[PDB]
Amino acid sequence: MISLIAALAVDRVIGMENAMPWNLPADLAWFKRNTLDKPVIMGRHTWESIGRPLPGRKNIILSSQPGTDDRVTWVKSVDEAIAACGDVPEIMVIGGGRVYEQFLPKAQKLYLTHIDAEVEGDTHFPDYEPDDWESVFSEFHDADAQNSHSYCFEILERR
Ligand SMILES: NC(=O)c1ccc[n+]([C@@H]2O[C@H](COP(=O)([O-])OP(=O)(O)OC[C@H]3O[C@@H](n4cnc5c(N)ncnc54)[C@H](OP(=O)(O)O)[C@@H]3O)[C@@H](O)[C@H]2O)c1
Numbered sequence: 001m002i003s004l005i006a007a008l009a010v011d012r013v014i015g016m017e018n019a020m021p022w023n024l025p026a027d028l029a030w031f032k033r034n035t036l037d038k039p040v041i042m043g044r045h046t047w048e049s050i051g052r053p054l055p056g057r058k059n060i061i062l063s064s065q066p067g068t069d070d071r072v073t074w075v076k077s078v079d080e081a082i083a084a085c086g087d088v089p090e091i092m093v094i095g096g097g098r099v100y101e102q103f104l105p106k107a108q109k110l111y112l113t114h115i116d117a118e119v120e121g122d123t124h125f126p127d128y129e130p131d132d133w134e135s136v137f138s139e140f141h142d143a144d145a146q147n148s149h150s151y152c153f154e155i156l157e158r159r
């Protein structure tokens with residue numbers, strides 16, 4: 001199966017500049033815990049934001065264009081992408097906008113972070129449709145020294 005993993009602020013907001021309008025080390029920890037030892041599909045811009053491969057996972061980039069880092073696996077099509085993983089149980093699609101927009105239809109599971117914050121952004125998360133999904137997990141957490149905002153992790157299964 002394929003899985004999307006995102007952190008949404010208010011209004012399904014996923015970013016500004018080519019940045020995340022928040023800083024939540026504990027979300028990343030959760031991100032990391034969910035992906036580790038699994039293939040992660042990103043897009044040229046997301047990749048540019050990360051800025052270096054992710055240890056313990058096969059990092060695949062989406063560029064129509066030629067790759068500029070030998071450390072990671074480059075791809076020019078979704079099919080390529082899906083191909084570049086091979087035979088694994090779960091492949092993780094890590095955005096951004098456009099990539100998400102294209103993978104939702106193929107996804108079977110979501111791992112979302114509902115950040116409690118109203119910030120303005122330029123990239124929004126694909127419009128999933130409630131009736132299709134089954135929220136099968138939730139965990140709440142309050143702002144703290146580290147995490148300026150509370151957030152709720154959730155997990156949904158394409159019904
Ligand atoms: N909150 C989160 O959970 C989360 C997760 C990821 C990203 N983000 C944020 O989202 C924003 C970036 O997302 P975005 O939608 O702007 O971009 P993106 O998906 O990260 O970057 C898109 C690029 O991907 C390449 N691409 C995408 N689909 C492709 C296809 N089928 N074949 C070839 N190339 C393809 C293109 O290549 P070329 O440039 O080579 O033409 C395109 O410019 C940032 O602010 C980022 O931090 C948030």
Ligand SMILES: Nc1nc(=O)c2nc(CNc3ccc(C(=O)N[C@@H](CCC(=O)O)C(=O)O)cc3)cnc2[nH]1
Pocket residue numbers: 005006007020027028029030031032046049050054055094095111112113
């Ligand atoms: N739930 C979730 N939250 C996010 O912040 C997120 N971010 C992306 C895209 N951006 C990033 C940016 C940084 C790291 C990152 O640094 N990962 C490290 C964690 C800690 C660190 O930066 O030191 C890792 O090892 O996984 C991952 C993805 C994709 N899916 C997400 N999914």
